[PDB]
Design a binder for this molecule. Structure first.
Ligand SMILES: N[C@@H](CCCC(=O)O)C(=O)O
Lengths: 509, 508, 509, 509
């Protein structure tokens, strides 16, 4: 009954997947823990099985990765760059079949699955460039015969914990950067996207092995909260990059702080789009559509709040309503399909709980609000009006496709309402006013890590640093100088002279 | 009985100090908390009194500072820099009396008191430069008609908690940088250096007043653990910069993380100097001396471990013993003096405890090891040989002037020994070998935040980022791009076109 | 006779000036060349005299500066910064009287004279910061046991030739930055602003001598074309910074290239302001006024061309005409005066030539166009309409207050019209349109070094690099990383190992 | 049968798309109405194939087509331009052995160097791809409320690239990869005697451009001699001219470009010294001197031409270098394990013999070599000359021949001055262990060269840093660090988002 044993899913073998797969890789493949079955959210059928990590597996893998680090850290960065380049090429080769696997096991539509892999490809190109550039400044010493320099060195082992909704790209951002920086990696992905984790690890393993490098440089330990907790408490994990819920993320941050580790937290969002009276509505409506119903509203960057100026409120809602009705629903791998299933059954229940609660708090469902009567975890993408900006149900990160719509009049109040939530990931305004754009980007504007103008809250490119503020956790990934989070800084002063002048002109003699 | 009431201490009035001083400043001066009396560690005589903050004082001050921020953050960064430039000049004007107050209340020698103020003057210079430079790159977008830019904005209120041993400079690092970045500051210093905190705050308050700015931009709430804990738990403190013990700092870090705040931790060090066989011994010996006994061994950057290659161990120890015997002890304001008192009687007690335990663990005191028979908190600077690199007593952070001396044979083992401690602040090797210096500065070398060659572990200049790794806490202050810790990064994409191309070429 | 001998002007003594002043400083004050008398352009009365350099003085000064360099380059950059900090303070103390001298000898109004000195103070503050920051990256080598670093070192002697129109600030830009970079400087200012050069050099000299530094670190050699030419041909002048006419600048650039020297050319502008239909006219009119008549139109950044969209052309010209009528003319040191004389009588003659040529090319003088009947070198600020955008006189830079006004309809053509001149210094558009601002700043927009939006062409701040493209010469001064032009880059590879791996994996064995 | 390309053993040439007669002009179309040149193999003096060069009209049409193509190319976002350069990188990767072999055949350098040269191109492509997501400038804090101050970078337009015989692939590649991601179009004129290499490289690039539906004139080719080169130097439509070649020609190129206020990047000759101090590791000194001197048969601009050895070790080093020279394997340069090939031309052989005779005429002792080799092709013995003084005239004439001049020295100060005393300033190396000395070498009183090395040869740079020299070497930089800024124009841009007009320096007008 496994999908992978059915003739139409034979393409899965192009990723090297079988009926039962090893979920631990450290140079060798294994897995002595529990076997998990993952399911297609589009039809609730079992795909294939993964043998997860046991305690012994985790312990062995950590030790092997750290031993592999002794070799990898000695390889010059541009040569490490060359490995990441080849990973980039290996992804390019598999991009359609890997994207199809993401569509099958996670449930996002094919163009987004392929697009997610493209993020990994892109950050590989960026990292290759970085491998020739990373480092610090030579600074002028105030002391004669001294050099003052900033050195950057790998932290060691980077633990990477990722979530179900971007089962490839987030690992990719971390992997590519942490690698060229001289670190080894240990991946624990979402249990419900284990096959994706295995498939990606198979691609990377072959590059490492083909370059006669130890596989444990990019290690994999599939597991649940037991493995993630072990990572958060493990002093041998020098940096823990965690992407997931705010609730879990807070505890991960506390555990890592308790051992004076380093953490990179990428947590939830409650992101807002704001449409001012002068906004190009031809930009607003498709932007809101993509930001809200993209990935069935299961992105951390998904727009969950839509603020519309009172003068254009009804008109925007009407046009958004017509747009929602023209969304093509189907199997996420099927063509021209723009809307797939939610990732889990539990998610469908929450969607129901939130829609009913929204009704109870005074809100009006102007579109959707119901489960689709069809196989899979399909719900109607939903629009709710009439609620206040401070309504409890709207201050609740539900990973459901529900968009809460609010009226506003003044710029000052609506900027405040953007900022009033606990999360601080993404935000966007739609406007032409020059001054307003300046204020939005300034000290009294958005408090988020991503601050956009005339585009959705979702769909970042890799060139900038990605992450948010407040309860979103403060970590940054991907571009700009996010690489510094994966390295340790040292301020080095070298005396090349025969004298000992002291800083600040202190005479100690 | 108060020193400030005696005529040979009348210079204290040049800093605006009196018999009883207000320890809360937020634009106005006050303090409803307990009155603390601070003592001169060189004679144990009371200097003057400071009325500390009550928790209600702190609450009012936080609110006023946040209101002031709304004004301050609207002032262009180069204009904020002009203010910091004037603080710089105001410090320059009072550098001698303020340095003398540092020597009187904290106990460090006058050249170090003055030198510490000079660090604040230096970072002011640096920050004035920064006020014209801070920002992020404009990046090329993969999308037609889009701009991709990185913006930096202030975090808001920066809480600053500092320790007794550097009562001016650490605040200064944080103040100058936080200010040009558009933040407001709230300072809680060490209770036993309250007068110094008040004196520094008076200097800054006058500059703010003269420039018609709200005083709460640089607020002061003198207090102890109750105020520090309030700051650690206060969601309105956007960034908490904490310098202090690893024990307290760990809890501070947890409290801040619990509320998803930002922290910058600057905690303890157990810093080593390593002298290889090819070392210039004429550099080794005075560097060890300065690193170990400067500030009477009370810096977080103090050399506490000295590894010496077998072949030169006895010669270096013998020369260091002769150098220690030439150290001139006395009142720290007497400018012929190189060595003053420990900051507290408690430090003396801990010193004696550590010396006794070192001996019980098999160490030999080859110099010092005893209290001095004079008023105040004086102990002999002390050298202990004979211990193994992993002796328990050498792995306890003792803020006292005891230098533990170890032998080694090979580079691999002694780099490991440098790295085996919980802290990771400063480290230094003395050698001429190129390959060794490369390895020391590389991925298999020192694991510390400060990695030096042929100089002490102490005495950084302000141009680089300052801080450590591991149990030192990971925070960075002062130079390089440390300013980024005082700001929030946003990645901003602006669509100037009439189209909506999506990232990664996705067709939706 | 001499103004410095009259009690109305006794404040000149505060700058250390006398009836006859030495125009050479190299540690000693001297001058064996011809004695020049400078005149106040407001009344054509002699101010004071200056003994200029002989070529022998020049020779001696170059040699003493290069000797001073051996000491100065050994001073750590942050300590050179402390010297520049003190120069900044010395300028602050004299800012009113030095500003007044600029007004007296050069002819610009008092607020502009003081402002020019303020630029020097600002760049001193900036330079003090730079003195702790200058240097280059440590890069990762592709080779084991190798370090790859970028070093920056002083070029040695920086010759600085400045023009009459900014007799303090341009030297200041060059001086503050060259000094912290570890260079010595040799200044030849405009002969007609000799007193200003002397006054500035006296301020700097006191700081150097008080610090027991060799005075030739900031040498002065007052003189004319003969000294300037010697500097251009002298191999011992490692960098020649030239600010002046494009005609002279080309020859200077050619003389420096012929000896493989370094040059930094800051030449003429033919700067345009463009007002679109959606422009805020309350910003346009006072911006055009300042940009056109500030410094009596004697800035290289002066607006000389004003393009106005057809719909608002007549309105703007009428409103500009009204603002011109309210300009207050008189002695520039008078605190109520808004408009002073041209710097020389030759400039009056050139003004007259250009106005008559504009009429002969078909232009209409709608305001001004006449020499004023009063002592000194005053002319009416002038507005000319009706010329074609490519009229010869409009494509000519005349250093006089003449503003040529053009009509346009579409953006593509007027962007081309901005770019069609030989010069490329400054440019400005007034508009609110988002897309148009993007294009203006982009590859098909303005070709100038300074590209402004909703402000005049003139009045840069110091934080950014200052300079232009095309016939403006290509040099950059002041902010950003302009400091690199005063230093030589070395790319340095250091082998710390016992092996010799070759770049690109070449095996030569 | 006479042409090598018509002989079966060289059939591999047709893998590069070469034939008996080739078109030497590419601008989207292939052509060439100019003189037909035949290039010869220097290893056997046999003709290889023919190339039809550009006429005047060809150059004229190509410049116009390139500048038309730029309108399309400059509008393509930098990261997408990077994707094109990435594909060029891949295409070179696939042809690297056969292209390297062609370099050995037509230019004469040995196979590992030919392949290594192509590897430099591949490496800079990887770097440029990274840069394509990074290039730009800082947002700076304005001193004025409601204003933004930013630095923009935009392409200059058409970049002319003139390259030399000795690096017929890599120099073009540095310029091409970087110029492309910066949004420029390029026009290449190579050495006539390496025309087939130019055509081969262009065929590889043209396929990538055409496959990507881009106008081929983006990377144009106009093979020709001095008439084409002079045209480019005088052509105002060439916005940036990058010239690699002799110093004498270079100065004339720089003068011509300055005369029209264009931009030039000059990469001219070197007279590079290695300095060995008494404490040097001689096991590094001897092979470094061997590679630096005899690699490329001494025909690099970075070739070590002067070897200074401390008096205490001079005889030992010379003796050891003699023995090393005798171990050099000579043969056909496209043969693997051959380490020494022919000079590029018969004229170079004559000039070699002349320089050797003059060296003896100046009192020099030939301790090794000095003679033509008894075999076909342009082979000479790599040569060592001792006994001369550092200022001997023959050691200050840049001969592209394998003659190493060896000097004695005693003191650090004198030998640093001797390094610096020549007119060129390209590369330099010291061999020492002394910390102070290395500090001094890299400092303001040390080497005056653009490349300043420690314990490695003068030649063999990696692409991560900027490449170029000082003084008569011309001042240009190519490849790494921020050399890309030479290919772009900087603008300092101020945007007023407010309704007010505060002026810089607080001027009230
Ligand atoms: N700060 C002045 C500098 C002008 C220089 C000049 O006119 O030559 C400005 O931006 O107008």
């Amino acid at each position: 009954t496994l999908l992978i044993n059915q003739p139409q899913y034979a393409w899965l073998k192009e990723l090297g997947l079988r009926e039962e797969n090893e979920g631990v890789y450290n140079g060798s493949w294994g897995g002595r823990g529990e076997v998990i079955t993952t399911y297609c959210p589009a039809n609730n059928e079992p795909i294939a099985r993964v043998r997860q990590a046991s305690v012994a597996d985790y312990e062995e893998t950590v030790k092997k990765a750290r031993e592999a680090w002794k070799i990898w850290a000695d390889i010059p960065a541009p040569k490490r760059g060359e490995i990441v380049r080849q990973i980039g090429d290996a992804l390019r080769e598999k991009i359609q079949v890997l994207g199809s696997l993401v569509s099958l096991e996670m449930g996002k539509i094919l163009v987004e699955g392929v697009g997610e892999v493209q993020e990994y490809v892109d950050i590989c190109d960026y990292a290759v460039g970085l491998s020739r550039m990373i480092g610090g400044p030579i600074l002028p010493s105030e002391r004669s015969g001294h050099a003052l320099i900033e050195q950057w060195n790998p932290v060691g082992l980077v633990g990477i914990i990722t979530a179900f909704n971007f089962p490839v790209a987030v690992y990719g951002w971390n992997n590519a950067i942490a690698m060229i920086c001289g670190n080894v990696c240990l991946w624990k992905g979402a249990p419900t996207t284990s096959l994706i984790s295995v498939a990606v690890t198979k691609i990377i393993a072959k590059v490492l092995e083909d370059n006669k490098l130890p596989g444990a440089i990019c290690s994999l330990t599939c597991g649940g909260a037991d493995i993630g907790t072990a990572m958060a408490k493990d002093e041998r994990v020098n940096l823990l990059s965690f992407t997931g819920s705010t609730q879990v993320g807070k505890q991960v941050g506390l555990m890592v702080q308790e051992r004076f580790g380093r953490s990179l937290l990428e947590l939830g969002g409650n992101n807002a789009i704001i449409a001012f009276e002068d906004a190009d509505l031809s930009l607003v409506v498709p932007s809101a559509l993509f930001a809200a119903v993209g990935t069935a509203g299961q992105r951390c960057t998904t727009a969950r709040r839509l603020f519309i100026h009172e003068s254009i409120h009804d008109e925007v809602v009407n046009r958004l309503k017509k747009a929602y009705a023209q969304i093509r629903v189907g199997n996420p791998w099927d063509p021209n399909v723009l809307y797939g299933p939610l990732h889990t059954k539990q998610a469908v229940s929450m969607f129901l709980g939130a829609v009913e609660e929204a009704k109870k708090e005074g809100g009006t469902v102007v579109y959707g609000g119901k489960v689709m009567d069809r196989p899979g975890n399909y719900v109607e993408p939903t629009i709710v009006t009439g609620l206040g900006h401070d309504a409890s149900i709207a201050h609740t990160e539900t990973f459901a496709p529900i968009l809460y719509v609010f009226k506003f009049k003044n710029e000052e109040e609506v900027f405040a309402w953007n900022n009033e939530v606990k999360q601080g990931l993404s935000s966007s305004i739609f406007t032409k006013d020059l001054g307003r754009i300046f204020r939005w980007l300034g000290p009294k504007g958005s408090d988020c890590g991503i601050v956009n103008v005339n585009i959705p809250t979702s769909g970042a490119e890799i060139g900038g640093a990605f992450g948010g503020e407040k309860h979103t956790g403060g970590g940054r990934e991907s571009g700009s100088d996010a690489w510094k989070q994966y390295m340790r800084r040292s301020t080095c002063t070298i005396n090349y002279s025969k004298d000992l002048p002291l800083a600040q002109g202190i005479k100690f003699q």
